[PDB]
Amino acid sequence: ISCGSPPPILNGRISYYSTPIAVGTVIRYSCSGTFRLIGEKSLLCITKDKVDGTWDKPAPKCEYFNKYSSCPEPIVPGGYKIRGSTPYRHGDSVTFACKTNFSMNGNKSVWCQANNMWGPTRLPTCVSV
Amino acid sequence: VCQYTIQSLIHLTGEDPGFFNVEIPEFPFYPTCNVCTADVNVTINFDVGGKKHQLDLDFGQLTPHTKAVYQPRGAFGGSENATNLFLLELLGAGELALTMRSKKLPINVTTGEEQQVSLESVDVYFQDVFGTMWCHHAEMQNPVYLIPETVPYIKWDNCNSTNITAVVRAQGLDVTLPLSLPTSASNFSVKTEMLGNEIDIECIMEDGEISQVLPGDNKFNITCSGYESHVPSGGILTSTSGYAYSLRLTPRPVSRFLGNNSILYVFYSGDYCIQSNIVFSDEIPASQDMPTNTTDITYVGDNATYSVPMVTSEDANSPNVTVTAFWAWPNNTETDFKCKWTLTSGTPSGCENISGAFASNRTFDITVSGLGTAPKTLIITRTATNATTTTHKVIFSKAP
Ligand SMILES: *[C@@H]1O[C@H](CO)[C@@H](O)[C@H](O)[C@H]1NC(C)=O
Ligand SMILES: *[C@@H]1O[C@H](CO)[C@@H](O)[C@H](O)[C@H]1NC(C)=O
Ligand SMILES: *[C@@H]1O[C@H](CO)[C@@H](O)[C@H](O)[C@H]1NC(C)=O
Ligand SMILES: *[C@@H]1O[C@H](CO)[C@@H](O)[C@H](O)[C@H]1NC(C)=O
Ligand SMILES: *[C@@H]1O[C@H](CO)[C@@H](O)[C@H](O)[C@H]1NC(C)=O
Ligand SMILES: *[C@@H]1O[C@H](CO)[C@@H](O)[C@H](O)[C@H]1NC(C)=O
Ligand SMILES: *[C@@H]1O[C@H](CO)[C@@H](O)[C@H](O)[C@H]1NC(C)=O
Ligand SMILES: *[C@@H]1O[C@H](CO)[C@@H](O)[C@H](O)[C@H]1NC(C)=O
Ligand SMILES: *[C@@H]1O[C@H](CO)[C@@H](O)[C@H](O)[C@H]1NC(C)=O
Ligand SMILES: *[C@@H]1O[C@H](CO)[C@@H](O)[C@H](O)[C@H]1NC(C)=O
Ligand SMILES: *[C@@H]1O[C@H](CO)[C@@H](O)[C@H](O)[C@H]1NC(C)=O
Ligand SMILES: *[C@@H]1O[C@H](CO)[C@@H](O)[C@H](O)[C@H]1NC(C)=O
């Protein structure tokens, strides 16, 4: 199998990859100096049907740096933070983990966006299932 | 048994670059001593899902005159190859750093606790030539979780190579790179990343971009990911006085876990990118000797006196005070380091031709006898609890 060219990113760049892209290849996204990267920065080429390759998540996005943005502390009931610390400014990230009795759903990491909200996804949940 | 203990409080802010760096600046490294050694052990204090777990590392005997980078001689309580995950580095001016890889577990844990390992504190134990046991306790303001993972190799396309090598000395990178831009003092922005051997350091400009670039040197602060050094990271954009720009970058700390032939990527805007190879000087950057004050004393006859005052922050009710002395360039660890005094002590056996005593002032008066005709240099060190170890270099010369 192989993956097609990775999804583009406006106002950013993508690390080097050889073509055709083999399953297992990791690429890195970065923003153009002034902008801030929102979302997971590494994409992985995987295969689910053993025929075609596909990337394992959408590309992140670059936001123009807003020096004023500030996000409130994110709180996940049943989980706890393993990365991040106040104050949270544009582009800063937090990473959560769930307590032992709980299982995580959603992305474990969120970023402080220019609109003062954590994104690009909602906060993950920690639920006992 | 620790005679003096230093306390520090460390806080990881940015992202984890693949290593945790702990600076230890207060252990004595004695000057004019090719022969002085130090026995060093380290204990890493982990929490594993609520269970306490200590990793003891044995670094053997430090030999600052000949070796600046040390790996553990052995580990107790650690995973296989735990000794490959830690470095002790001499930084110059009596300072050292302990570096640990953060993305490989150094201890054994169960299936399910692999993401529940947090680093609580690091204790460093340092026994000097005089037998004094020093201890440093570095506490994490918040326990830092280790997130184990394998870091894939990444390379950035569309980056101009420079023949200029970025040289790291004592965890400090120094490099000056020529840039060019159409505009000319025109704001300036720069960020860097250093990539190698599963390490990824990112440095950005604290205070944001340069909105108005003045002529001459434009000093700006930069913040690198990981544990910050007490020496600030910074850069300088030199403007010609289209127009010439020179970029000096002095980020720190830059761990040799990156390996030689790691790459420094410089992304700048006025994105342009230049890349330079990183090399780690195996040679010591500067004298490892702790800083000293020098005093020239003249004498007539064969007796000379020197008064050692209390050190900075030394309180009149300090539980422990220690004064030590040795003649410069000693030859024998077995007999040249017996001159040690505490608040309860006499001139020990083997300390020959030197006497000392504390006054009620806590001033320490030392007297030297049998002084020949040639100048002789005495290295005097004083420490007190919660105080600053101070070393005096006293040169005794015959009165002319
Ligand atoms: C969840 O774990 C706590 C201890 O962390 C325990 O007291 C409690 O009984 C557990 N609950 C369940 C449903 O297992
Ligand atoms: C992470 O967020 C993306 C959207 O950006 C979503 O498509 C994906 O399913 C999320 N991951 C998980 C494990 O839910
Ligand atoms: C003074 O040193 C002794 C050992 O020499 C140690 O037990 C004691 O804790 C020290 N005092 C203080 C205040 O640290
Ligand atoms: C360090 O640990 C070793 C055990 O390998 C021990 O022999 C040595 O005495 C220790 N040094 C100290 C406590 O200064
Ligand atoms: C950790 O596991 C390794 C197996 O690779 C073993 O050799 C080592 O002794 C263990 N550590 C202990 C028992 O402290
Ligand atoms: C970089 O170094 C190589 C070494 O041979 C040289 O060929 C090349 O011209 C150099 N270019 C720059 C911009 O330094
Ligand atoms: C950073 O350094 C610059 C000089 O390079 C100085 O003007 C500024 O006050 C410093 N600020 C901080 C927070 O270090
Ligand atoms: C490399 O240099 C050329 C001209 O010197 C320039 O046009 C190009 O943008 C540079 N590449 C990068 C990535 O800055
Ligand atoms: C890295 O390269 C420098 C310069 O060639 C050399 O002095 C040093 O010993 C090297 N360090 C290694 C290979 O660990
Ligand atoms: C040092 O020598 C002088 C010589 O006049 C003498 O008066 C003094 O008592 C001596 N002090 C000691 C401590 O021997
Ligand atoms: C302490 O007392 C000694 C007398 O032995 C005297 O020489 C010295 O000046 C005094 N120092 C202070 C700070 O009082
Ligand atoms: C005096 O010497 C000590 C040596 O321990 C040094 O640390 C101190 O900085 C010196 N004094 C000044 C004012 O620099």
Side-chain angles (χ1 to χ4, degrees), chain A residues 2-129, chain B:
Chain A
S2 66
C3 284
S5 282
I9 181 172
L10 185 36
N11 297 320
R13 53 160 65 231
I14 301 172
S15 60
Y16 167 89
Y17 52 92
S18 187
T19 61
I21 309 179
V23 175
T25 293
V26 178
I27 57 162
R28 172 90 70 82
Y29 286 73
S30 179
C31 292
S32 278
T34 39
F35 292 69
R36 292 300 199 271
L37 191 72
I38 303 299
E40 291 291 351
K41 67 198 209 286
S42 294
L43 261 66
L44 174 67
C45 178
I46 68 175
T47 182
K48 20 222 249 294
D49 55 11
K50 306 180 58 37
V51 180
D52 295 333
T54 58
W55 300 101
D56 71 326
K57 79 257 286 171
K61 297 177 232 168
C62 294
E63 292 197 286
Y64 188 77
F65 173 57
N66 190 284
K67 158 179 69 168
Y68 306 111
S69 305
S70 172
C71 299
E73 180 182 4
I75 300 280
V76 174
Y80 58 100
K81 300 170 187 64
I82 58 176
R83 290 290 187 272
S85 61
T86 194
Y88 306 103
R89 318 196 272 157
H90 191 209
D92 298 336
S93 66
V94 165
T95 298
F96 290 98
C98 293
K99 296 189 287 170
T100 15
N101 294 336
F102 302 80
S103 298
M104 181 172 288
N105 280 86
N107 281 267
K108 61 183 170 134
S109 291
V110 285
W111 285 257
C112 179
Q113 299 184 149
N115 70 346
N116 299 290
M117 293 178 179
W118 292 100
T121 65
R122 272 86 126 176
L123 292 180
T125 62
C126 291
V127 178
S128 200
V129 177
Chain B
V1 173
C2 301
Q3 292 98 356
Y4 303 101
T5 69
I6 297 99
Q7 302 284 348
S8 73
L9 194 52
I10 306 173
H11 183 40
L12 175 70
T13 297
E15 120 151 27
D16 163 26
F19 62 92
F20 299 151
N21 198 56
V22 177
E23 301 189 301
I24 300 145
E26 314 283 71
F27 292 153
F29 287 84
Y30 299 103
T32 57
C33 190
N34 267 14
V35 159
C36 288
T37 69
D39 175 297
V40 176
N41 289 342
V42 173
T43 292
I44 312 296
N45 299 297
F46 294 102
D47 183 334
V48 185
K51 160 195 200 313
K52 302 311 182 199
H53 188 146
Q54 283 180 17
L55 170 62
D56 299 331
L57 303 167
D58 180 0
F59 278 91
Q61 282 202 346
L62 305 190
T63 56
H65 177 247
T66 179
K67 181 165 160 213
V69 175
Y70 298 83
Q71 296 175 106
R73 219 196 58 183
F76 191 67
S79 59
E80 187 176 0
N81 312 331
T83 59
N84 265 321
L85 305 176
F86 295 91
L87 286 172
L88 193 66
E89 235 197 282
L90 304 181
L91 303 180
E95 305 205 2
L96 58 82
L98 178 78
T99 307
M100 164 175 48
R101 284 188 104 103
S102 59
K103 289 167 153 45
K104 268 186 158 196
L105 290 179
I107 59 186
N108 292 335
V109 304
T110 67
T111 69
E113 268 154 24
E114 206 161 78
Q115 313 300 318
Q116 284 185 269
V117 175
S118 63
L119 171 83
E120 292 189 337
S121 66
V122 176
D123 298 309
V124 181
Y125 301 106
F126 183 104
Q127 186 181 301
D128 70 13
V129 295
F130 290 102
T132 302
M133 177 62 68
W134 306 77
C135 303
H136 184 104
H137 182 83
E139 177 109 309
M140 311 316 311
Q141 151 163 14
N142 291 318
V144 179
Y145 283 86
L146 281 60
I147 304 182
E149 67 184 0
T150 299
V151 177
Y153 171 65
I154 279 89
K155 138 183 251 78
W156 292 106
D157 249 329
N158 189 236
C159 287
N160 284 323
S161 296
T162 181
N163 282 191
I164 300 180
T165 303
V167 182
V168 180
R169 303 182 162 94
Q171 297 191 335
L173 183 143
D174 198 332
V175 73
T176 304
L177 297 173
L179 320 173
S180 211
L181 295 168
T183 64
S184 300
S186 184
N187 43 7
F188 185 76
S189 176
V190 66
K191 62 173 295 194
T192 74
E193 55 188 336
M194 301 164 236
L195 293 174
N197 193 30
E198 291 185 69
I199 300 296
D200 175 12
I201 309 176
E202 182 184 0
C203 306
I204 61 97
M205 300 169 73
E206 184 65 279
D207 312 324
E209 69 285 359
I210 309 314
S211 312
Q212 50 179 60
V213 170
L214 314 179
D217 290 3
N218 291 266
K219 304 174 75 214
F220 62 92
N221 285 337
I222 72 104
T223 315
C224 297
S225 54
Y227 288 115
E228 273 179 82
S229 170
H230 70 82
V231 172
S233 290
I236 302 181
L237 181 68
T238 292
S239 167
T240 191
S241 62
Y243 298 60
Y245 284 97
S246 223
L247 179 67
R248 184 110 115 72
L249 296 169
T250 309
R252 64 177 309 107
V254 179
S255 171
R256 69 178 58 239
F257 278 130
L258 278 162
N260 265 1
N261 311 287
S262 56
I263 296 167
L264 165 72
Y265 295 94
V266 181
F267 306 93
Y268 62 97
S269 181
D271 259 49
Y272 300 131
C273 176
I274 54 183
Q275 65 179 94
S276 155
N277 273 22
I278 303 172
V279 300
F280 291 89
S281 186
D282 267 325
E283 296 175 350
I284 189 178
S287 172
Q288 179 62 18
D289 298 355
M290 65 194 298
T292 56
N293 251 281
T294 301
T295 300
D296 285 83
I297 303 291
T298 55
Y299 63 95
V300 300
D302 75 327
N303 229 13
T305 295
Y306 185 79
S307 299
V308 187
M310 295 191 283
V311 300
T312 306
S313 299
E314 185 174 349
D315 187 3
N317 262 34
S318 159
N320 294 324
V321 186
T322 298
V323 173
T324 184
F326 70 90
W327 293 109
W329 309 109
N331 230 13
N332 182 351
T333 58
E334 298 292 298
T335 46
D336 292 349
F337 301 96
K338 296 305 195 73
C339 299
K340 183 221 294 205
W341 299 264
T342 46
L343 285 179
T344 80
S345 178
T347 300
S349 353
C351 183
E352 305 187 19
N353 297 343
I354 301 181
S355 352
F358 292 99
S360 303
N361 258 344
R362 299 290 179 86
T363 297
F364 190 82
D365 300 304
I366 183 161
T367 300
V368 290
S369 62
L371 293 176
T373 291
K376 298 222 137 185
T377 307
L378 188 68
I379 306 306
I380 303 169
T381 306
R382 177 166 184 152
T383 309
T385 67
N386 293 335
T388 310
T389 301
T390 304
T391 293
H392 305 262
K393 189 149 142 177
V394 182
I395 307 178
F396 298 100
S397 66
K398 201 74 162 174

